[PDB]
Structure 1
Amino acid sequence: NPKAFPLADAALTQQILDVVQQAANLRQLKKGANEATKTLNRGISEFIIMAADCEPIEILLHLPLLCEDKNVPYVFVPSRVALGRACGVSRPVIAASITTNDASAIKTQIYAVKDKIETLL
């Protein structure tokens, strides 16, 4: 898929899914395509993780428009099943959004991974 342009390599996926898992435990994370779109319109999203093997790809390809329109970093990971396991819900999630909060224990990791994604863009 060339439409999934920024696709993470292995180590980048590992870092991203670890940050997603910590953000889910702290509950700084919003799961699902519609909930991620709502967070983006609210302007409270830190950054966007999407799946790549979603069936099909357009139903979340609607997101990069809003993503760089409000200038939010976004990334694609290969497996929506991996994304669901990392989010910590029993169903495969195709798009998750780390929100913004600075009274948060994982601010440093969030900023590191967001910087690395932005460099990949």
Structure 2
Amino acid sequence: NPLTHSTPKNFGIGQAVQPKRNLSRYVKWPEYVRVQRQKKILSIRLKVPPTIAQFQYTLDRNTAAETFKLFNKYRPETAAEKKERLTKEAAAVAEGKSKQDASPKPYAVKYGLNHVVALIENKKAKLVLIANDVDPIELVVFLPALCKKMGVPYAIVKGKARLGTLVNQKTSAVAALTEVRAEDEAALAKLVSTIDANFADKYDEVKKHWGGGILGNKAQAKMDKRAKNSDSA
């Protein structure tokens, strides 16, 4: 009120300088930004062949969380942990005269691509996890097919980084179980089943299903409006 005054302001073309708005939709990104964006786009416009696109079908957040939960109980030794174990066996074994078996049979997650592969091949794994990233996708594309043939129940999972966490590397590519303490075989059968029902069983049908072929949405609206109107008046 006082000697204060309502002025409004008219931004209606022809007058008043435009205000500051969010041009974020318009900013001229650095090329590296523009490329990786359009890579994802271009990747989706093309019709991607079935043996890719069987990926993208990531495990669901609930089951996975339940699966990381288990796998976490099986992390590989830590630097300390192993150092500690050594001095335990290195001292004790050599004197107590045990057969290099004053160490308990370790149960941990198997990893590394080449490791896990011969494992699957030798029917020793019981649950392979495969990341959905993995940029030369080839390191990994033969795995569902493989795991299928070896009757080894597997799951494609969000997170090469996250497979990396549970194994102490930045990344991982694959994480696998072969062994397990009896206190856990229970929830692993359970786990294996959800997974088996989402992947291994569905593998044959997924194999027939090409992917991609998706329009951008300026084009989508174009034919959602052209195809609404044309046929049904």
TM over 0.5: yes
> In the aligned structure 1, how far is the partner of 2:161 from the partner of 2:176?
16
Deviation at 1:6, TM superposition (A): 4.3
Change (3 A) 1:100 1:112: same
For 2:73, the equivalent position in structure 1 comes to: 22
Answering whether residue 223 of structure 2 is matched by residue 116 of structure 1, we say: no
- Structure with bigger strand share is 1
Higher relative contact order (CA 8 A, sep 6+): 1
Q: Which has the larger radius of gyration?
A: 2
- How far residue 7 of structure 1 moved from its aligned partner, in angstroms, is 1.6
Partners of 2:123 and 2:152 within 8 A in 1: no
Q: Does 1:50 align with 2:101?
A: no
CA RMSD of aligned residues (A): 1.9
CA offset digits 1:35-67 (Å, max 9, x no partner): 110111221110110101111222111212220
What's the secondary structure of 1:93's corresponding residue? coil
**Hey, what does 2:206 align to over in structure 1?**
none
Residue aligning to 2:114:
34
Unmatched 5+ stretches in structure 2: 1-51, 77-105, 200-233
1:82 partner amino acid: R
In structure 1, the gaps of 5 or more residues are none
The counterpart of 2:182, out of the listed 96, 104, 112, is: 104
| SS of equivalent residue, structure 1 residue 90 | coil
Q: TM-score, normalised by structure 1?
A: 0.85
State TM-score, norm by structure 2: 0.47
Give the Cα–Cα distance (whole angstroms) in 2 for the partners of residues 15 and 6 of structure 1.
Answer: 18
| Deviation string, structure 1 residues 2-41 (Cα, Å, up to 9, x no partner) | 1316421111221121122123366332111111101112
8 Å contact 1:18–1:86 — kept in the other structure?
no
Which 4+ runs in 1 deviate beyond 2 A? 23-28
User: How many residues get paired?
Assistant: 119
